[PDB]
């Protein structure tokens, strides 16, 4: 039944608009089909299967085009697919590494609870197994704990069917981390903790971090300003915003018994 | 049905006669300790 | 009051307060704790 | 035949009281809440709730359900006589023989008190008909002809969940009688419906019967609809938290000064599985302090396990004994071991509690717990040593630890600044911290801005005992 | 996740939005209330053909986060299969608020001599005459002259 549905099945990209045309034959499956209000009698739900296989290889599509929103869309697709309450479905071949997209997708953009969710939602399958997972959550346990380095010591292993694009993402989250974390409240650093922290010896870009944060390339030598914190005194008054304060608060003292 | 809700509503906000029935007991009082 | 989810849920031990206080520190040791006047 | 009795004693002055008396609490009254009885009743399913309900087995089978159901009429005065045949015909138990007629023929026994006539008017004496029979049914949940009653009888529940929503027509108050049975009760459907699996549409039973309860009559009945739905998403996976950051409407007269309690204790657990230290420690903390009583035998303690787990995360808390049970000791064998591995420092230590006790650490269920307890180590390392010495070496911090490099002990101490803790610095030539502590940080206007709070704080507990001297 | 699947810039796949929608609109309960804002997109927008339902869902998720006035706002925004329905929670409280904003704009314009008034926004009016007809052809004229009362 319904046999073109497969009509990109198995050479992934010729193009961005064949796979439009497939995006309009999975039109055609929202026009007939629907998925979610499809309660139960599990053969209407075999193109279904069918349906989470070729949006697994859709999110493929989504990383090959870079397209974020159709991530996040594709990715809201298969949390649906595994939010739909027959959940006796055949064991979904991408569900690894659907998780380890999500998870390292959050870990590129400094979440801080749907981590946990995600520590939540399926905890079983990720100190026993499941190494596109496995990794990311002791790698995140590592990239807390104090190290920047085991970046590469893991970049020794992991393409991950295109997570190429996310550890990218993660150099970038190195790196902008670097340029708050640089001086927070530091002395000062010298070409070399820029060579050990920073990577890529220099480009244009630390020359850029110098002449992009207001920052002073000294001899070669490094400081936040001359003075790195702006000079902190707050006022040298805070005797007149509490005596405000102690008029509201003889005032509310007042009216009362 | 629609209004005839609100005053039977408003009818629920009557422990004001009821605080207010400490505080008039507290006038009798106090204003019967002053008379005394 | 048990209406929650809950239906299916100073001898040795106060000085064991002070002692977990304590367990990571100086057992008894008492050589140790004497021989470190001899060593210089 | 002479304990059954005390059963018959206690099922007259429970209905008499609710019957005869919430329903003269209900014909005029209520300003506030009038139906002292309502409370009354809800003591007395706490009594039943010690004791057994009412015929439980009591040495015969099925007496009490079949009895008192029958002829209430509500209607000229001698209704009194109909209490005298529901008193008198306790020469059934003690002379006569006893028969079964419980949990098979309740079925026309529940249309016995409509099908005599036109009984009365209220809903507390339905809520009453279906409740106080079907209560004393529901703690016996042994899965073999008793549970597929419990299911049905909270079928019947349900249909009291359409005679809350469709009685009375508009605006009068017996739902301060009906949910506050009601939360005992749905309670217990959440129980009998998750003691065989997780509940679907129950989830849209529960989200309706919280929609119906907005405005109209918002009256104990959103707060503990709410914890049902909090445990609901508290036992199955976590998504509809969201609904709470986007929907937070959770803010009533906190009126059974428990249910407050446990309810931000169950939140509590929420921003403790979200992400939290300081506002999950301090509703832990104020749930702790707002425990009710020690009337309830070891119940606070394997709630409080999982209560103090965040400040196990702390890495500040000492030894935790003085909460512990002795019946808890034999279940807290990982957990005594577990803060004693707070307390030490050592790693194969802190992995062989693990390696050692991971069956009731899935028991908790929580390994957030581990997956920042190792960070929690060395920020108690870097607390302790931090606090103690003013230009200490990252070098012998480090190799105290056993860092066995600097540049990993250079982005501790960095994310440690990025924490926030201590000041400390590194005179970069190859580490080798340069540090200070702090005293002369400030100590004269700052406290007087916290007492701001304090007294502000203060007058607002003055201006609530005030409203609180209104009442009588 | 049910809105990043709006990339489609017609209606044609709002309306399969929609389809899920009224399919699991009170489990995703969560989930619509950061769609306001793409809501709001589809009611501002006029090539929207379905803005009608748009302010449906709109006045349907206002009525689960306690908006009201916006609720009458999309409520008039609904369209004429609004004032029809005889449900018993959702229709009739805010028609209740909404023909209380009926008679307070009554007396406000009772209360504002000869016009300058706010004019009858079009999808008032409806249960007005039409439920005015079940209080009429009820066969007693109470409510007939309590609204009689209501508008001064």
Same mark, same amino acid.
């Given at each position: 039944?319904?046999?073109?549905?497969?009509?990109?099945?198995?050479?992934?990209?010729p193009?961005?608009?064949?796979?439009?045309?497939?995006?309009?034959?999975?039109?055609?499956?929202?026009?007939?089909?629907?998925?979610?209000?499809?309660?139960?009698?599990?053969?209407?739900?075999?193109?279904?299967?069918?349906?989470?296989?070729?949006?697994?290889?859709?999110?493929?599509?989504?990383?090959?085009?870079?397209?974020?929103?159709?991530?996040?869309?594709?990715? @809201?697709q298969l949390?649906?697919?595994?939010?739909?309450?027959?959940?006796?479905?055949?064991?979904? @071949?991408?569900?690894?590494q659907?998780?380890?997209?999500?998870?390292?997708?959050?870990?590129?953009?400094?979440?801080?609870?749907?981590?946990?969710?995600?520590?939540?939602?399926?905890?079983?399958?990720?100190?026993?197994?499941?190494?596109?997972?496995?990794?990311?959550?002791?790698?995140?346990?590592?990239?807390?704990?104090?190290?920047?380095?085991?970046?590469?010591?893991?970049?020794?292993?992991?393409? @991950?069917?295109?997570?190429?694009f996310?550890?990218?993402?993660?150099?970038?989250?190195?790196?902008?981390?670097?340029?708050?974390?640089?001086?927070?409240?530091?002395?000062k650093?010298?070409?070399?903790?820029?060579?050990?922290?920073?990577?890529?010896?220099?480009?244009?870009?630390?020359?850029?971090?110098?002449?992009?944060?207001?920052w002073?390339?000294?001899?070669?030598?490094?400081?936040?300003?001359?003075?790195?914190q702006?000079?902190?005194?707050?006022?040298?008054?805070?005797?007149?915003?509490?005596?405000?304060?102690?008029?509201?608060?003889?005032?509310q003292?007042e009216?009362?018994? | 049905?629609?209004?005839?809700?609100?005053?039977?509503?408003?009818?629920?906000?009557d422990?004001?006669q009821?605080?207010?029935?400490?505080?008039?007991?507290?006038?009798?009082?106090?204003?019967?300790?002053?008379?005394? | 009051?048990?209406?929650?989810?809950?239906?299916?849920?100073?001898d040795?031990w106060?000085?064991?307060?002070?002692?977990?206080?304590?367990?990571?520190?100086?057992?008894?040791?008492?050589?140790?704790?004497?021989?470190?006047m001899?060593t210089? | 035949?002479?304990?059954?009795?005390?059963?018959?004693?206690?099922?007259?002055?429970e209905?008499?009281?609710? !019957?005869?008396? =919430?329903?003269?609490?209900?014909?005029?009254?209520? +300003?506030?809440?009038?139906?002292e009885?309502?409370?009354? *009743?809800?003591?007395?399913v706490?009594?039943?709730?010690?004791?057994?309900?009412?015929?439980q #087995?009591?040495?015969?089978?099925?007496?009490?359900?079949?009895?008192?159901?029958?002829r209430?009429?509500?209607?000229?005065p001698?209704? =009194?006589?109909?209490?005298?045949?529901?008193? #008198?015909?306790?020469?059934?138990? !003690?002379?006569?023989?006893?028969?079964?007629?419980?949990?098979?023929?309740?079925?026309?026994?529940?249309?016995?008190?409509?099908?005599?006539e036109?009984?009365?008017?209220?809903?507390?004496?339905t809520?009453?008909?279906?409740?106080?029979?079907?209560?004393p *049914?529901?703690?016996?949940?042994?899965?073999?002809?008793?549970?597929?009653?419990?299911?049905n009888?909270?079928?019947?529940?349900?249909?009291?969940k359409?005679?809350?929503?469709?009685?009375?027509?508009?605006?009068?108050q017996?739902?301060?009688?009906?949910?506050?049975?009601?939360?005992?009760?749905?309670?217990?459907?959440?129980?009998v419906?998750?003691?065989?699996?997780?509940?679907?549409?129950?989830?849209?039973?529960?989200?309706?019967?919280? $929609?119906?309860?907005?405005?109209?009559?918002?009256?104990?009945?959103?707060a503990?609809? #709410?914890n049902?739905?909090? $445990?609901?998403?508290?036992?199955?996976?976590?998504?509809?938290?969201? *609904?709470?950051?986007?929907?937070?409407?959770?803010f009533?007269?906190?009126?059974?000064?428990?249910?407050?309690?446990?309810?931000?204790?169950?939140?509590? $657990?929420?921003?403790?599985?979200?992400?939290?230290?300081?506002?999950?420690?301090?509703?832990?903390?104020?749930?702790?302090?707002? +425990?009710?009583?020690?009337?309830?035998?070891?119940?606070?303690?394997?709630?409080?396990?999982?209560?103090?787990?965040?400040?196990?995360?702390?890495?500040?808390?000492?030894?935790?004994?003085?909460?512990?049970?002795?019946?808890?000791?034999?279940?807290?064998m990982?957990?005594?071991?577990?803060?004693?591995?707070?307390?030490?420092?050592?790693?194969?230590?802190?992995?062989?509690?693990?390696?050692?006790? !991971? *069956?009731?650490?899935?028991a908790?269920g929580?390994?957030?717990?581990?997956?920042?307890?190792?960070?929690?180590?060395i920020?108690?390392?870097?607390?302790?040593? =931090?606090?103690?010495?003013?230009?200490?070496?990252?070098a012998?911090?480090?190799?105290?630890?056993?860092?066995?490099?600097?540049?990993?002990?250079?982005?501790?101490?960095?994310?440690?600044?990025?924490? !926030?803790?201590?000041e400390?610095?590194?005179?970069?030539?190859?580490?080798?911290?340069?540090?200070?502590?702090?005293?002369d940080?400030?100590?004269?206007?700052?406290?007087?801005?916290?007492?701001?709070?304090?007294?502000?704080?203060?007058?607002?507990?003055?201006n609530?005992?005030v409203?609180?001297?209104?009442?009588? | 996740?049910?809105?990043?699947?709006?990339?489609?810039?017609?209606?044609?796949?709002?309306?399969?939005?929609?389809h899920?929608?009224?399919?699991v609109?009170?489990?995703?309960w969560?989930?619509?209330?950061?769609?306001?804002?793409?809501?709001?997109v589809?009611?501002?927008?006029?090539?929207?053909?379905?803005?009608?339902?748009?302010?449906?869902?709109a006045?349907?998720?206002?009525?689960h986060?306690?908006?009201?006035?916006?609720?009458?706002?999309?409520?008039?925004?609904?369209?004429?299969?609004?004032?029809?329905?005889?449900?018993?929670?959702?229709?009739?409280?805010?028609?209740?608020?909404?023909?209380?904003?009926?008679?307070?704009?009554?007396?406000?314009?009772?209360?504002?001599?000869?016009?300058?008034?706010?004019?009858?926004?079009?999808?008032?009016?409806?249960?007005?005459?039409?439920?005015?007809?079940?209080?009429?052809?009820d066969?007693?004229?109470?409510?007939?002259?309590?609204?009689?009362?209501?508008?001064?």
């Amino acid at each position: 039944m319904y046999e073109q549905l497969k009509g990109e099945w198995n050479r992934k990209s010729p193009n961005l608009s064949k796979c439009g045309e497939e995006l309009g034959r999975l039109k055609l499956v929202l026009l007939e089909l629907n998925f979610l209000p499809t309660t139960g009698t599990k053969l209407t739900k075999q193109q279904l299967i069918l349906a989470r296989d070729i949006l697994e290889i859709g999110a493929q599509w989504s990383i090959l085009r870079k397209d974020i929103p159709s991530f996040e869309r594709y990715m @809201a697709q298969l949390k649906c697919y595994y939010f739909d309450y027959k959940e006796q479905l055949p064991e979904s @071949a991408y569900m690894h590494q659907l998780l380890g997209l999500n998870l390292l997708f959050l870990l590129s953009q400094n979440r801080v609870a749907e981590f946990h969710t995600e520590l939540e939602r399926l905890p079983a399958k990720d100190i026993q197994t499941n190494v596109y997972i496995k990794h990311p959550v002791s790698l995140e346990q590592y990239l807390m704990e104090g190290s920047y380095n085991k970046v590469f010591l893991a970049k020794g292993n992991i393409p @991950a069917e295109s997570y190429t694009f996310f550890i990218d993402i993660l150099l970038d989250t190195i790196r902008d981390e670097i340029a708050g974390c640089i001086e927070k409240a530091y002395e000062k650093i010298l070409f070399t903790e820029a060579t050990r922290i920073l990577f890529f010896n220099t480009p244009k870009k630390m020359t850029d971090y110098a002449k992009k944060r207001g920052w002073v390339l000294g001899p070669n030598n490094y400081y936040s300003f001359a003075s790195q914190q702006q000079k902190p005194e707050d006022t040298t008054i805070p005797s007149t915003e509490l005596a405000k304060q102690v008029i509201e608060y003889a005032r509310q003292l007042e009216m009362i018994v | 049905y629609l209004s005839k809700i609100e005053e039977l509503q408003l009818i629920v906000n009557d422990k004001s006669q009821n605080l207010r029935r400490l505080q008039a007991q507290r006038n009798e009082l106090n204003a019967k300790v002053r008379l005394l | 009051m048990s209406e929650k989810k809950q239906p299916v849920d100073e001898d040795n031990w106060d000085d064991d307060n002070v002692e977990d206080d304590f367990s990571n520190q100086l057992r008894a040791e008492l050589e140790k704790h004497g021989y470190k006047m001899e060593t210089s | 035949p002479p304990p059954p009795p005390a059963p018959q004693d206690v099922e007259m002055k429970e209905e008499a009281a609710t !019957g005869g008396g =919430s329903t003269g609490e209900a014909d005029g009254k209520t +300003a506030a809440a009038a139906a002292e009885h309502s409370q009354r *009743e809800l003591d007395t399913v706490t009594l039943e709730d010690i004791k057994e309900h009412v015929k439980q #087995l009591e040495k015969a089978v099925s007496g009490k359900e079949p009895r008192f159901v029958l002829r209430a009429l509500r209607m000229l005065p001698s209704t =009194s006589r109909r209490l005298n045949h529901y008193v #008198l015909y306790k020469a059934v138990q !003690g002379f006569f023989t006893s028969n079964n007629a419980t949990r098979d023929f309740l079925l026309p026994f529940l249309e016995e008190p409509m099908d005599t006539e036109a009984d009365l008017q209220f809903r507390p004496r339905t809520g009453k008909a279906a409740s106080t029979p079907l209560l004393p *049914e529901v703690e016996a949940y042994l899965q073999l002809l008793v549970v597929i009653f419990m299911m049905n009888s909270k079928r019947y529940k349900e249909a009291q969940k359409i005679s809350d929503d469709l009685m009375q027509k508009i605006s009068t108050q017996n739902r301060r009688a009906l949910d506050l049975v009601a939360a005992k009760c749905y309670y217990y459907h959440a129980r009998v419906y998750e003691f065989l699996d997780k509940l679907d549409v129950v989830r849209s039973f529960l989200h309706a019967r919280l $929609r119906t309860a907005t405005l109209r009559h918002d009256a104990d009945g959103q707060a503990t609809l #709410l914890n049902l739905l909090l $445990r609901n998403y508290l036992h199955y996976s976590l998504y509809d938290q969201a *609904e709470k950051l986007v929907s937070k409407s959770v803010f009533p007269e906190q009126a059974n000064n428990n249910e407050w309690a446990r309810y931000l204790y169950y939140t509590g $657990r929420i921003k403790a599985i979200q992400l939290e230290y300081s506002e999950a420690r301090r509703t832990m903390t104020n749930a702790l302090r707002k +425990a009710p009583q020690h009337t309830a035998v070891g119940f606070k303690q394997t709630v409080h396990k999982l209560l103090i787990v965040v400040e196990l995360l702390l890495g500040e808390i000492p030894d935790r004994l003085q909460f512990r049970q002795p019946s808890l000791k034999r279940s807290l064998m990982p957990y005594f071991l577990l803060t004693q591995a707070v307390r030490t420092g050592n790693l194969a230590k802190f992995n062989q509690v693990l390696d050692q006790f !991971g *069956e009731k650490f899935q028991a908790d269920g929580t390994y957030t717990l581990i997956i920042r307890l190792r960070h929690n180590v060395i920020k108690t390392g870097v607390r302790m040593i =931090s606090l103690s010495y003013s230009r200490i070496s990252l070098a012998d911090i480090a190799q105290k630890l056993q860092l066995d490099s600097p540049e990993d002990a250079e982005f501790i101490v960095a994310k440690a600044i990025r924490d !926030g803790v201590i000041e400390a610095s590194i005179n970069h030539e190859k580490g080798y911290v340069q540090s200070k502590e702090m005293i002369d940080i400030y100590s004269t206007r700052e406290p007087q801005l916290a007492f701001h709070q304090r007294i502000s704080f203060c007058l607002d507990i003055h201006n609530m005992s005030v409203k609180a001297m209104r009442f009588p | 996740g049910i809105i990043s699947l709006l990339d489609e810039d017609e209606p044609q796949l709002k309306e399969f939005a929609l389809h899920k929608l009224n399919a699991v609109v009170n489990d995703f309960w969560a989930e619509i209330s950061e769609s306001v804002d793409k809501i709001e997109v589809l009611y501002e927008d006029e090539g929207f053909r379905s803005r009608q339902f748009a302010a449906l869902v709109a006045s349907k998720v206002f009525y689960h986060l306690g908006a009201f006035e916006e609720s009458l706002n999309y409520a008039l925004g609904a369209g004429d299969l609004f004032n029809v329905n005889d449900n018993s929670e959702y229709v009739e409280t805010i028609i209740a608020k909404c023909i209380d904003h009926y008679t307070k704009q009554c007396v406000e314009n009772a209360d504002l001599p000869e016009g300058e008034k706010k004019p009858i926004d079009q999808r008032l009016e409806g249960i007005v005459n039409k439920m005015f007809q079940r209080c009429l052809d009820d066969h007693k004229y109470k409510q007939a002259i309590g609204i009689a009362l209501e508008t001064r």
